[PDB]
Amino acid sequence: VASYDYLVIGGGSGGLASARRAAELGARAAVVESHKLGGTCVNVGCVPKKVMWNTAVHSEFMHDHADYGFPSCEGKFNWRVIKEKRDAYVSRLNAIYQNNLTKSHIEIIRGHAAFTSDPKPTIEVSGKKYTAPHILIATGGMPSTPHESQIPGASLGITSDGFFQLEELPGRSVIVGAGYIAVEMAGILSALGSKTSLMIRHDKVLRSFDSMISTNCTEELENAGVEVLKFSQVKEVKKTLSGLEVSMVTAVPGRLPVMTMIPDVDCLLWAIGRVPNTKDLSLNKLGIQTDDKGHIIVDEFQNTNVKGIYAVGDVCGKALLTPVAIAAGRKLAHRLFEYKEDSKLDYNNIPTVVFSHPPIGTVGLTEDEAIHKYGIENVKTYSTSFTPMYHAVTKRKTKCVMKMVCANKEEKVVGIHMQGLGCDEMLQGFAVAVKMGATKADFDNTVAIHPTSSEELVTLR
Amino acid sequence: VASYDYLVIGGGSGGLASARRAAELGARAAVVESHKLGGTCVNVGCVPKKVMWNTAVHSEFMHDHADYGFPSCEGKFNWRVIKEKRDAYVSRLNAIYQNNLTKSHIEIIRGHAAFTSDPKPTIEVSGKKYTAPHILIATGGMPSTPHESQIPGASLGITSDGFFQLEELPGRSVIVGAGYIAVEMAGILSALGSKTSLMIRHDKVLRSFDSMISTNCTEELENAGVEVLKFSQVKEVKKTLSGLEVSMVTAVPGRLPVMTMIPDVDCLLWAIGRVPNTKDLSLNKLGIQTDDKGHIIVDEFQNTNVKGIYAVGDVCGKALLTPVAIAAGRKLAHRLFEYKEDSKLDYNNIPTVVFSHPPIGTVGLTEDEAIHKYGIENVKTYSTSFTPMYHAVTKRKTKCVMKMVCANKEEKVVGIHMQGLGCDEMLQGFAVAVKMGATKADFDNTVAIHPTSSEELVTLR
Ligand SMILES: Cc1cc2nc3c(=O)[nH]c(=O)nc-3n(C[C@H](O)[C@H](O)[C@H](O)COP(=O)(O)OP(=O)(O)OC[C@H]3O[C@@H](n4cnc5c(N)ncnc54)[C@H](O)[C@@H]3O)c2cc1C
Ligand SMILES: Cc1cc2nc3c(=O)[nH]c(=O)nc-3n(C[C@H](O)[C@H](O)[C@H](O)COP(=O)(O)OP(=O)(O)OC[C@H]3O[C@@H](n4cnc5c(N)ncnc54)[C@H](O)[C@@H]3O)c2cc1C
Ligand SMILES: N[C@@H](CCC(=O)N[C@@H](CSSC[C@H](NC(=O)CC[C@H](N)C(=O)O)C(=O)NCC(=O)O)C(=O)NCC(=O)O)C(=O)O
Numbered sequence: 052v053a054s055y056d057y058l059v060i061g062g063g064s065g066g067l068a069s070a071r072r073a074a075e076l077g078a079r080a081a082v083v084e085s086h087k088l089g090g091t092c093v094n095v096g097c098v099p100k101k102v103m104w105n106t107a108v109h110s111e112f113m114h115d116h117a118d119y120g121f122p123s124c125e126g127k128f129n130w131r132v133i134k135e136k137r138d139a140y141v142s143r144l145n146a147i148y149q150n151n152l153t154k155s156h157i158e159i160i161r162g163h164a165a166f167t168s169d170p171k172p173t174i175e176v177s178g179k180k181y182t183a184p185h186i187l188i189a190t191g192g193m194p195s196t197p198h199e200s201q202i203p204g205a206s207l208g209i210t211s212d213g214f215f216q217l218e219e220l221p222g223r224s225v226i227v228g229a230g231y232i233a234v235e236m237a238g239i240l241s242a243l244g245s246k247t248s249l250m251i252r253h254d255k256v257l258r259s260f261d262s263m264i265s266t267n268c269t270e271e272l273e274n275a276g277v278e279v280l281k282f283s284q285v286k287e288v289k290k291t292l293s294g295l296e297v298s299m300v301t302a303v304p305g306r307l308p309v310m311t312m313i314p315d316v317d318c319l320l321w322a323i324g325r326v327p328n329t330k331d332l333s334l335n336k337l338g339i340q341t342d343d344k345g346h347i348i349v350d351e352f353q354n355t356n357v358k359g360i361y362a363v364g365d366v367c368g369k370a371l372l373t374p375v376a377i378a379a380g381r382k383l384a385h386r387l388f389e390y391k392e393d394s395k396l397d398y399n400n401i402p403t404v405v406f407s408h409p410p411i412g413t414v415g416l417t418e419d420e421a422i423h424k425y426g427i428e429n430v431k432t433y434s435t436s437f438t439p440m441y442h443a444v445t446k447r448k449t450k451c452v453m454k455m456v457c458a459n460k461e462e463k464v465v466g467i468h469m470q471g472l473g474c475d476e477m478l479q480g481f482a483v484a485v486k487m488g489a490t491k492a493d494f495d496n497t498v499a500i501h502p503t504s505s506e507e508l509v510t511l512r
Numbered sequence: 513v514a515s516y517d518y519l520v521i522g523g524g525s526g527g528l529a530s531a532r533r534a535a536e537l538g539a540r541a542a543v544v545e546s547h548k549l550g551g552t553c554v555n556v557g558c559v560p561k562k563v564m565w566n567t568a569v570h571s572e573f574m575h576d577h578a579d580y581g582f583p584s585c586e587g588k589f590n591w592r593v594i595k596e597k598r599d600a601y602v603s604r605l606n607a608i609y610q611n612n613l614t615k616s617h618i619e620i621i622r623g624h625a626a627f628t629s630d631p632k633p634t635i636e637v638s639g640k641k642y643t644a645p646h647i648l649i650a651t652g653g654m655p656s657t658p659h660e661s662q663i664p665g666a667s668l669g670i671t672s673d674g675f676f677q678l679e680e681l682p683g684r685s686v687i688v689g690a691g692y693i694a695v696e697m698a699g700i701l702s703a704l705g706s707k708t709s710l711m712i713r714h715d716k717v718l719r720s721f722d723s724m725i726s727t728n729c730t731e732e733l734e735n736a737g738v739e740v741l742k743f744s745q746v747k748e749v750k751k752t753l754s755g756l757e758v759s760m761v762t763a764v765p766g767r768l769p770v771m772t773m774i775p776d777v778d779c780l781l782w783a784i785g786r787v788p789n790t791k792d793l794s795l796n797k798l799g800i801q802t803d804d805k806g807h808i809i810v811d812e813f814q815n816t817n818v819k820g821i822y823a824v825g826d827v828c829g830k831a832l833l834t835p836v837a838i839a840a841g842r843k844l845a846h847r848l849f850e851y852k853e854d855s856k857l858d859y860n861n862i863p864t865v866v867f868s869h870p871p872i873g874t875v876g877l878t879e880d881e882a883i884h885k886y887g888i889e890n891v892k893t894y895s896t897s898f899t900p901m902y903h904a905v906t907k908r909k910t911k912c913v914m915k916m917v918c919a920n921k922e923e924k925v926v927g928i929h930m931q932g933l934g935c936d937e938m939l940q941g942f943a944v945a946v947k948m949g950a951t952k953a954d955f956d957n958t959v960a961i962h963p964t965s966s967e968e969l970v971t972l973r
């Protein structure tokens with residue numbers, strides 16, 4: 052039994068960040084990783100997605116070429132060219148992260164970890180045992196797929212993991228789900244020329260976002276050629292002579308249900324959610340508490356119910372983002388190795404960007420959330436809608452919408468929501484201001500930058 | 513003599529903004545405008561510039577088309593296409609601003625105003641007199657050109673005003689000056705295919721910006737095909753059989769001066785500075801104080817030395833930006849018509865974006881300025897240099913540089929400087945944070961947005 056100061060299960064965003072910080076603090080740490088370092092974000096998440104987004108963005112801008120005085124750009128996108136370059140980039144990152152661990156003197160244990168029956172919390176990886184007075188579980192999650200039992204032929208569709216393995220652009224694609232990944236994939240496939248449908252259970256996407264965003268986002272998708280099938284769900288999928296055939300039920304409220312077959316489908320993509328990866332950890336050998344979806348339960352300091360066992364990131368199932376896992380992993384290292392007992396992550400005011408077309412940025416409370424928190428009488432919003440100057444000369448248009456949610460008489464800024472060109476890079480600094488407790492006066496007293504989209508947020512009336 | 517509550521001389525950024533706010537407050541106002549409403553920013557400044565920048569940006573992105581899996585885009589930019597659309601857009605804005613005044617019940621007096629000899633401050637426009645207990649001078653400025661006396665043939669070159677009248681892309685262009693307009697014009701001309709030289713008196717552009725920016729900017733220009741002629745100045749210009757021929761002296765320190773002729777120049781563009789437009793106002797009839805360049809002198813509340821006479825914007829010659837004139841014009845209206853005596857613009861921490869390639873954003877103190885203000889022992893900077901993920905797959909590269917200037921033990925953020933893709937839209941919110949007095953802790957405690965360039969500012973170590 053080899054002992055360490057800190058054992059980290061999972062070499063993804065949270066696991067890498069926590070191990071690295073702990074090592075800086077003097078801890079003798081090891082990272083257990085069964086697949087590729089960098090975890091979901093590097094291999095099949097943030098990175099490859101952003102590359103594909105940049106690619107789709109190229110497609111769109113190329114539609115405006117002629118408006119801008121250039122000669123028309125003619126054609127066919129070549130999927131394998133970009134696919135090969137994307138894969139190489141990911142390989143580069145895998146090598147970098149491995150180096151990052153080595154330079155920090157962090158041991159890398161390759162293989163799948165599971166807890167043992169042993170009294171003191173101990174793990175086994177390939178027949179060898181390892182132990183530490185502090186063990187971090189950061190095994191992340193995976194894409195959720197339906198059971199053949201409830202949707203026959205569901206196994207014929209792929210997930211976002213499968214998306215990153217595609218070698219050719221699918222002719223016809225159907226995406227099921229209404230959350231960020233669904234929206235992002237539909238947007239990439241459509242821009243690159245796939246005849247895309249997005250199938251959602253209700254009438255809008257991103258229904259958990261502020262209502263101005265879910266509405267606007269649903270519209271922009273339609274404007275960009277994505278067919279949004281509302282109140283629809285898959286009833287069954289089958290392999291026909293040439294592609295898949297999707298049976299769906301459309302149940303608009305106030306209407307009779309109607310069944311429709313979708314033929315000649317090349318790609319059926321499930322983007323219905325993520326499941327935590329805890330199934331094969333042998334948690335129950337230590338009685339570690341999970342919820343009914345398999346998420347590990349933790350307190351505000353990332354503690355599990357078992358002393359010296361912590362969990363961070365996607366496995367805990369809250370705020371499923373790379374930077375959250377990183378921040379929580381880091382705070383935890385300071386608490387354990389720097390004896391900063393108050394060291395923990397504040398889960399309020401975490402900013403998010405959705406790489407749609409145009410991108411979405413949000414931080415803080417939606418209007419409804421502020422209303423429930425402070426009361427209708429105490430919430431005031433400010434909003435704007437405009438056409439970015441970029442489209443002053445194009446036949447193709449997109450809009451920019453922004454909304455500011457204020458609370459109390461002071462008009463404290465409690466939420467910012469926007470969609471529009473530039474929004475992906477614009478959010479960060481306002482997120483700083485919101486975190487600091489800025490009020491509308493603070494925004495208003497900041498001199499604008501002209502001409503930009505960002506200035507609109509500081510001149511709301 | 514028609515009397516008003518507020519008379520505004522000049523219908524540009526500051527004049528329009530001040531008149532509009534004053535009218536909301538109940539003032540009976542009139543705007544005197546001799547040319548087109550919208551002033552410099554709309555007609556020959558911010559607006560037409562940004563359109564041309566978006567155009568140049570198209571040119572660059574089109575160089576990356578093939579890297580991104582598309583087929584090569586072949587060719588020739590057509591200047592008149594975009595020129596015509598740009599002009600129309602400007603016409604649209606002129607009509608909008610006229611409407612904006614009318615809806616506010618602001619009178620528009622068309623023609624050139626000048627003060628009279630009359631005891632109580634009174635102006636004349638086309639033989640008619642007008643007076644008000646509060647008169648705002650907001651006549652803006654103009655491009656500076658050399659005297660034929662000092663540079664023979666200087667009148668053969670054009671200024672940024674002339675740039676906006678060009679109907680064809682110049683084959684060969686030489687830009688003289690090293691400030692923002694010079695940098696911006698060189699960047700647009702070069703990207704659109706003009707064989708461009710930028711002639712500067714020293715070794716770097718933007719020498720008043722933080723030194724990381726002047727260095728980086730000078731390099732990025734060279735990388736983008738702009739020939740930067742250092743320690744060079746024009747000695748004379750002459751009209752040859754086919755274009756202009758520019759005689760220049762190059763005086764590198766530690767070397768003998770060398771004279772060079774630049775032949776076959778289509779466009780010589782002077783971007784050496786701006787002069788205030790006060791020459792024809794008859795200021796001296798009221799003894800209004802100006803400096804030796806003709807700028808009107810004001811106090812912190814925009815008062816001139818004469819009671820009931822104020823000046824804002826470019827004419828005062830400080831912080832020559834549209835949003836500054838607007839903010840100062842607005843604050844002034846509140847002070848005069850809302851009796852808010854403390855109402856004035858804080859000229860510290862005004863953010864600026866330079867539309868170079870890539871764009872530059874800056875707010876607050878340069879490292880040197882912080883050093884002079886707090887002392888070397890009390891200043892700490894943090895900086896980063898990286899390749900944006902956009903270029904992970906391109907043969908063409910650009911860099912992103914960021915620098916954070918902190919002061920005292922608290923590490924108050926007193927300056928932010930950066931250059932890179934996305935920087936134009938990224939600045940605004942950090943400018944809010946800086947204005948609020950954020951410290952490095954406040955930035956560090958803000959969760960990052962991944963993957964973006966903006967996150968780099970919140971994860972500096
Ligand atoms: C398509 C997609 C796009 C996304 N885009 C973004 C984005 O743009 N921005 C963003 O912020 N977030 C994005 N995310 C989310 C982000 O990827 C996750 O929040 C983040 O990766 C979670 O980090 P983690 O450390 O919890 O787990 P992961 O990064 O999943 O790491 C878990 C690691 O543990 C390993 N492992 C699991 N079990 C074991 C075991 N028993 N033994 C050994 N090793 C084990 C796994 O192989 C893996 O490498 C995206 C996700 C997806 C799926
Ligand atoms: C090429 C260029 C690019 C620029 N780009 C930007 C940018 O991207 N962002 C930015 O923030 N700033 C930019 N600026 C600067 C910005 O344009 C100025 O700071 C702003 O226009 C100054 O506003 P103002 O109200 O002082 O004067 P102006 O907008 O110049 O208005 C002065 C007005 O007064 C009128 N006038 C003058 N004298 C008289 C008289 N005697 N009687 C009647 N009418 C009179 C003039 O016709 C004019 O319309 C740019 C400037 C230039 C030249
Ligand atoms: N953000 C810019 C620059 C591009 C970029 O971020 N490139 C790196 C790979 S990002 S995916 C891996 C992820 N890293 C992050 O989330 C950034 C964290 C941030 N730097 C911070 O310090 O908080 C991750 O798993 N991190 C774990 C960890 O940091 O321990 C890159 O080049 N990495 C290689 C390297 O030099 O180390 C952009 O998007 O353009």
Ligand SMILES: N[C@@H](CCC(=O)N[C@@H](CSSC[C@H](NC(=O)CC[C@H](N)C(=O)O)C(=O)NCC(=O)O)C(=O)NCC(=O)O)C(=O)O
Pocket residue numbers: 437438439440441499501502503504506507510524525528529532550553554558559605608612834835838
């Ligand atoms: N900023 C966005 C949207 C594009 C945009 O700004 N379009 C307007 C013309 S901008 S040039 C005239 C300038 N206006 C500004 O500087 C914006 C001021 C800001 N809105 C504020 O309230 O502080 C000006 O001279 N303003 C004087 C004044 O505001 O009184 C536009 O469409 N204007 C027409 C209109 O609807 O009124 C982008 O860049 O994409």
